[PDB]
Ligand binder design. Structure first.
Ligand code: FXX
Ligand code: ZN
Length: 288
């Protein structure tokens, strides 16, 4: 049988909060079969646990935030995406503050950490969620769809009205049977804009954003293009966010995702919509 995975080892990393702008302490730990990815706030007494589930998703304004009463964790999408990309079913994620360290603003640091800690196979079948029929959500001009597909494919399109895109719709599509998540999706950074950042810093927000975690754009052009790692990088980060959002299902996905100018709100809306639709999906394990 294809088996569940966790971490061979504990691993500790340090970085800065995307809004606080100050050091935050992160530990990845092995976890038992059928745990899922569980976040815990070790800076509080008692320690508070937030399972990474569709139901526990909060505000979704700029990042995917999980919530439990007054306890929250901001910016979970990049690390969940790394978890989803390397097939990590079970892990504990300890945090000394309210957010995941931003690191370089992509999944690459998390992918690296998970790999260094080692992948540990567990004596239980990997549970996959197969899309049986089409599910879609819409909010104005924004749309997100699930489609039956035998494999894992993700597509994203966005007409972003900024000169750096030369009037062109931005589109990217990744079938993960024939393309590598780590090599071609995991290192993607988003586009920061001096107008958005300029305001946010001056409104006491995103004190962590810089050229270290985003591609800074000035309402005309990318400011130093030395930052780029990919062609069509901005849609690719949309694909990266989408895989982190989709993993709040708690299981790997057999099927197809299509994003039309979507993000955190609509991705979670699509997830809750699918879960509600019992004839839309099923759970399956495989032989190897
Ligand atoms: N997942 C979101 C992307 C989204 O919701 O489109 C994201 O990565 N945001 C993000 C990442 C790094 C820095 C940042 O602040 C900045 F503003 F300073 F750049 C924002
Ligand atoms: Zn992101």
């Amino acid at each position: 049988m294809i088996k569940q995975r966790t971490l061979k080892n504990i691993i500790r990393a340090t970085g800065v909060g995307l809004h606080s702008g100050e050091k935050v302490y992160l530990t990845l730990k092995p976890a038992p079969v059928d745990t899922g990815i569980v976040f815990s706030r070790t800076d509080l007494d008692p320690v508070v646990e937030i399972p990474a589930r569709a139901e526990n998703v909060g505000e979704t304004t700029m990042s995917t935030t999980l919530v439990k009463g007054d306890v929250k964790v901001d910016t979970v999408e990049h690390l969940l995406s790394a978890m989803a990309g390397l097939g990590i079913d079970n892990a504990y994620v300890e945090l000394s503050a309210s957010e995941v360290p931003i690191m370089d603003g992509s999944a690459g640091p998390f992918v690296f950490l998970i790999q260094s800690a080692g992948l540990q196979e567990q004596e239980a079948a990997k549970k996959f969620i197969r899309i049986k029929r089409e599910v879609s959500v819409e909010e104005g001009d924004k749309r997100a769809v699930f489609v039956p597909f035998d494999g894992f494919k993700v597509s994203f399109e966005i007409d972003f009205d900024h000169p750096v895109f030369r009037g062109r719709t931005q589109q990217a599509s990744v079938d993960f049977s024939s393309t590598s998540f780590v090599k071609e999706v995991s290192r993607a950074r988003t586009f920061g804009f001096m107008r958005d950042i300029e305001y946010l810093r001056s409104q006491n927000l995103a004190l962590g954003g810089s050229v270290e975690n985003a591609i800074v754009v000035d309402e005309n052009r990318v400011l130093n293009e030395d930052g780029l790692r990919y062609e069509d990088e901005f849609v690719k980060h949309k694909i990266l966010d989408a895989i982190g959002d989709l993993y709040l299902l708690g299981n790997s996905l057999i099927g197809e995702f299509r994003g039309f100018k979507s993000g955190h709100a609509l991705n979670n809306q699509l997830l809750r919509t699918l879960i509600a639709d019992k004839d839309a999906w099923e759970v399956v394990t495989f032989e190897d």
